[PDB]
């Protein structure tokens, strides 16, 4: 506690959360992004909105937040308020009517190597096309396009943690079964700028309805 108090005071005495945490402005901050789907809260076919409970793990190295553990009694990791540090501004591009960005600023785990792990919770109300023709026996391919809103791919590169979303903590929905899921990183190019790519990670879930209820109560 005494060691960690000293450490936190010394880390944040001159920290700036405005500029990117690189040593050289020509370097790219590389952010690993992992989506954990905790619960599929709702599907709204009328307004075409999918409500999901997620944990959005982000990992990156902050150059200025290194320390030597032997200076601080063997403290190898600390927990700090995430409002103090620079963070990537991941935005849900296909937000329907929820929050575009993270709003629950939980604690960041910071390691002596400067590696930061942040795992904020979120509720995503994404917008996706709903195909109702076969209802109730339909299946929906609905997606979440995540990307840095104001940084382009030449200054902050985002990489998916795994080719699939994390479903280990997923609570079983009572009306929809996730047939499959997958995350793809994309790198769009524009006619202004042959050099700078624009990056996004689109997670998608193919979910199938459990029709039994509509069989009993309607059919």
């Amino acid at each position, epitope marked *: 506690s*005494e*060691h960690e108090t*000293r*450490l936190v005071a*010394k*880390l944040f*005495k*001159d*920290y700036s959360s405005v500029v990117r945490p690189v040593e050289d402005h020509r370097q790219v901050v590389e952010v690993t992004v992992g989506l954990q789907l905790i619960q599929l809260i709702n599907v709204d076919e009328v307004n075409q909105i999918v409500t999901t409970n997620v944990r959005l793990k982000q990992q990156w190295v902050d150059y*200025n*937040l*290194k*320390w*030597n*553990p*032997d*200076d*601080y*009694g*063997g403290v190898k990791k600390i927990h700090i308020p995430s409002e103090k540090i620079w963070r990537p501004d991941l935005v849900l591009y296909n937000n329907a009517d929820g929050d575009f960005a993270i709003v629950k600023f939980t604690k960041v785990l910071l390691q*002596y190597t400067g590696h930061i792990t942040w795992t904020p919770p979120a509720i995503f109300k994404s917008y996706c096309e709903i195909i109702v023709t076969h209802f109730p026996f339909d299946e929906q391919n609905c997606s979440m396009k995540l990307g840095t809103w104001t940084y382009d791919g030449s200054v902050v590169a985002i990489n998916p943690e795994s080719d699939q979303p994390d479903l280990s903590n997923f609570m079983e929905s009572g009306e929809w079964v996730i047939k499959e899921s997958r995350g793809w990183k994309h790198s769009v190019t524009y006619s202004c700028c042959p050099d700078t790519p624009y990056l996004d990670i689109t997670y998608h879930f193919v979910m199938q309805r459990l029709p039994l209820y509509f069989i009993v109560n309607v059919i």
Partner: antibody
Amino acid sequence: EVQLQESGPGLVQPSETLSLTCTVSGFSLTSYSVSWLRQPSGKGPEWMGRMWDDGGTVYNSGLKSRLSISRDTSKNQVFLKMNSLQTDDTGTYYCTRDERIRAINWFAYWGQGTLVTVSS
Amino acid sequence: DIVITQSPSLLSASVGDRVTLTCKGSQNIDNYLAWYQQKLGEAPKLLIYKTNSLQTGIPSRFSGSGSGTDYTLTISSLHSEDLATYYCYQYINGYTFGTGTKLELKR
């Protein structure tokens, strides 16, 4: 400008205590950390501990139980007391002034070093 | 902690020669390497820190370089005053020092 006069007894008996004093000139202990290095005879240097500018201390984990470091800002002195001395503790002792960048420290200035020999 | 080795252990050189000393770690030191010079009966003096930054007031002869686990210190033109022991050390995970390189006059 910066000077660190390390001093103390040359010969020490086993199992008794050793006292060393580093007197600082050219800077204030309230704004620079001081650290103690040891160079055993026939071996490379090793770091023992640091007196922080804020008045705290930290020690090498292997020497945590045997070492005490303290300071007096009124006359710019830093003191090292060590117990349970053995023949293996013979060597040259340096006090150093440390630079910082954020939470990273390195040894920037050294004292002239005092030879301490443990013998009977 | 990171183990450090220095080479050569002794180096015979003549005044005016360019000379290079090598320091190698057991793990990535991430440029947190420093070089300091020691003479007999003299207080150690820091030469280089963070692999490149000259200590204030040090002659421009000394220049450092390296990456990963391998680092070097170079003297462009060896003066007679530079015959001494050179230590590399790291300050990123613990504090560990090399065995020293004793740069000595050719004969």
